[PDB]
Amino acid sequence: SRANDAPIVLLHGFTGWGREEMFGFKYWGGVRGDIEQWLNDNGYRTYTLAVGPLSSNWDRACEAYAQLVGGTVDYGAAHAAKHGHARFGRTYPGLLPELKRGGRIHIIAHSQGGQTARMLVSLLENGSQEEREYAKAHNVSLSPLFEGGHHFVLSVTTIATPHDGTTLVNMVDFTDRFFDFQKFVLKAAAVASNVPYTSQVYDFKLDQWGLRRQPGESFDQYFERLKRSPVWTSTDTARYDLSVPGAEKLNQWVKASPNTYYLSFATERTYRGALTGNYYPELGMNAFSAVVCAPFLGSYRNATLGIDDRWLENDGIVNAFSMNGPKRGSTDRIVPYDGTIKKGVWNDMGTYNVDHFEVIGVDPNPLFDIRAFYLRLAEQLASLQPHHHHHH
Ligand SMILES: [Ca+2]
Ligand SMILES: [Zn+2]
Numbered sequence: 001s002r003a004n005d006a007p008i009v010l011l012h013g014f015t016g017w018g019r020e021e022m023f024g025f026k027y028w029g030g031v032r033g034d035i036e037q038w039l040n041d042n043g044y045r046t047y048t049l050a051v052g053p054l055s056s057n058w059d060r061a062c063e064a065y066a067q068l069v070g071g072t073v074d075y076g077a078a079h080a081a082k083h084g085h086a087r088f089g090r091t092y093p094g095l096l097p098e099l100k101r102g103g104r105i106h107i108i109a110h111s112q113g114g115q116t117a118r119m120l121v122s123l124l125e126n127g128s129q130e131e132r133e134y135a136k137a138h139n140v141s142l143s144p145l146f147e148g149g150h151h152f153v154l155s156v157t158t159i160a161t162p163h164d165g166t167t168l169v170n171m172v173d174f175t176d177r178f179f180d181f182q183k184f185v186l187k188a189a190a191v192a193s194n195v196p197y198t199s200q201v202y203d204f205k206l207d208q209w210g211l212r213r214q215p216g217e218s219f220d221q222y223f224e225r226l227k228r229s230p231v232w233t234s235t236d237t238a239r240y241d242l243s244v245p246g247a248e249k250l251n252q253w254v255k256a257s258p259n260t261y262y263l264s265f266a267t268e269r270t271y272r273g274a275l276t277g278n279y280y281p282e283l284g285m286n287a288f289s290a291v292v293c294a295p296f297l298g299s300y301r302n303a304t305l306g307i308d309d310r311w312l313e314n315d316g317i318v319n320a321f322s323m324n325g326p327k328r329g330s331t332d333r334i335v336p337y338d339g340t341i342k343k344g345v346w347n348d349m350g351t352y353n354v355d356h357f358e359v360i361g362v363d364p365n366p367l368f369d370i371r372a373f374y375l376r377l378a379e380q381l382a383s384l385q386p387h388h389h390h391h392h
Contacts, residue, residue, distance in 0.1 A: 002382040006104045006154050007045040007096065010036060011064070012360075013111025013161075014178075014238050015185045017202055018050035025189035028110075032361030032370050044378040047095050052205040053182075054226070056236045057112070057250060059208060061120040063089065065145045068105075068152070070094020074143035075208060078134035083236040085208040104154040106381045110360050111318070114161025114264075115241060115250060118326070122254045124150035155261040155381055160315055160356050163264075164322035165247030167300050167307055168293055169239065175232070177293060178239075179223045181317070184288040186219060188362050193219040206231055244305060247322070248329035256332045258344040261384055264334075266323035266348075267315035269355035270298055279312040285355050286363045289316030317356040324348040341380070343388055 016027045019036070028035040028048060039046040051063040059075060066073045066089075073089030080087040096103065109117040127148030135142040144150070171177055183193045191201060196218045206212065209231050213222045231237055240246040256262055270279040279298030281290040297314040301307055306328075313320040325334040325346030334346040341347050352373075358365035 003385045004104070004154060004382060005045075006106050006381075006386075007047060008039060008106045008108055008378060008381065009068070009096075010046065010048045011107055011109040011113035011117055012050070012053070013109075013113045014053055014242065015111075015181060016050060016053050016113070019048055021050070021200070021202055022185075022189040022191065023201070027185075027362065028360055029370075030188060030357075030360060030362035031364050035361070035370075035374055038371055038374060039378055042375060042378070044382060046378075049095075050205075051116070052238075054204060054231050054238045055206070055208075056238060057115045057119045057241045059089075059236070060116045061123055062143070062145065063205070064116065064120050065124070065143075066090075066094075067092045068094065068096050069099050070097060073207075074145070076128060076131045076134075076143060076146055077138070077140045078128075078130050079236075080208075081134075083230075083234060085230070085236070086210070089207045090205065099152045104152055104386065106155045106157070106384075107153060108157045108159070108377065108381075109161065110159045111161060111356065112238060112242060114156070114158030114163065115247065115254075117156045117158065118254050118256070118262075119250070121153045121156055121257050121260055124148075124152055125257050125259070151259060153257070153260050154386060155263065155384060157263040157265070157377065157381065158323070159265045160267040160318055160323060160359055161264070162242060162247060162318045162322045163251070163324070163326040164319075164328040165244035166242055166297075166318045166322060167244060167302075167311060168297060168317060169243040169246075170300060170302070170307075171292070171296050173292075175227055179227065180288055182223060183219065184286065184357075185362060188357075191219075193223075195219075196221075204231075244307070244328065247326075251326040251328055251330040251332075254326070255330075256344055256346065261341055261343050262325070262346045263341065263380075264324050264346050264348050266320050266351040267318075267354050267356060267359055268313050268320045268351050269315050269353065269358070270294060270313055272313075277309060277312075279314060281316060284358075284365060285316050286357055289355065289357070293317060315354070315356040315359075320351060323351075341384060 128146040131146035281294035357363040
């Protein structure tokens with residue numbers, strides 16, 4: 001039963017927004033309802049983070065930290081100089097000031113949020129040697145996130161995360177297809193992309209890059225500006241971290257903490273053609289994933305890059321193979337769940353038959369008991385022991 005009372009913190013992917021955005025239409029729950037509310041109602045204290053959807057995992061980590069303890073976002077001086085964006089971002093009140101006094105949390109992340117979560121846990125525990133060295137050499141201030149020694153995260157649970165990247169980034173037309181998912185979520189929320197709404201609606205939180213939707217500019221128009229901006233052309237981007245090479249790079253330094261439990265859930269919404277060996281999208285998958293993305297994922301091979309048949313199964317957006325945990329460029333160990341959740345390693349909870357967006361309720365799927373899924377997940381997280389004694 002319950003063994004800890006750590007609060008749960010939700011974290012989105014390359015799409016996502018705060019509770020007040022999209023006129024209330026939740027990322028965590030979508031057409032289903034409000035996941036956070038379900039958990040709160042059932043006795044699992046839960047909060048939601050909202051960071052930059054298209055920003056680099058690093059940026060997102062920095063934003064999350066600030067968002068969790070309060071203060072002004074500090075991306076790190078070395079980092080900011082390297083990538084040419086602002087050092088300081090937006091300020092936050094802090095959702096959980098208790099973290100500054102011994103508290104702990106469980107992070108439940110979806111999609112790219114799993115990469116963010118892992119990076120956050122890595123920075124909190126080990127800081128950034130680079131950031132630390134730069135401060136000493138240049139006399140600049142240093143964010144507590146880069147010092148090391150924080151123990152805030154009891155667990156990290158990922159759902160449909162591209163731990164090893166996604167080959168979707170290899171599509172010749174990825175640029176346009178990816179932003180189309182930005183239009184999709186807008187459509188799910190009943191928001192048009194060809195309208196210059198005066199209300200913010202969906203804030204990409206690109207304060208470091210000094211980009212924002214301007215008066216008279218629809219999302220469609222904005223997206224075209226973004227495609228040409230550094231949030232799309234730089235290596236300090238979600239675009240980069242999402243790619244197979246990018247994820248590998250990340251995995252080479254973002255390691256599982258021995259003091260944290262990691263759980264992984266994979267998603268699949270495809271079938272295998274008996275003659276092609278390819279995978280095809282199942283009935284029920286959103287049109288934005290099914291037309292050109294799912295088929296590309298289910299048929300794209302590249303032997304030099306090491307994309308083989310194992311990678312074809314997918315959830316319309318990410319290759320299932322890349323979800324159970326980091327593998328490419330990683331020293332992290334993955335163990336198939338057996339009824340016991342082990343600390344400091346990836347507990348592969350298996351593959352669920354739900355698509356990238358049906359898993360968080362953004363796309364309907366009446367056959368998927370979303371409430372049960374999340375309640376069972378919470379139940380599991382609340383049963384983890386912050387201190388596991390060794391035994392026979
Ligand atoms: Ca569906
Ligand atoms: Zn950055």
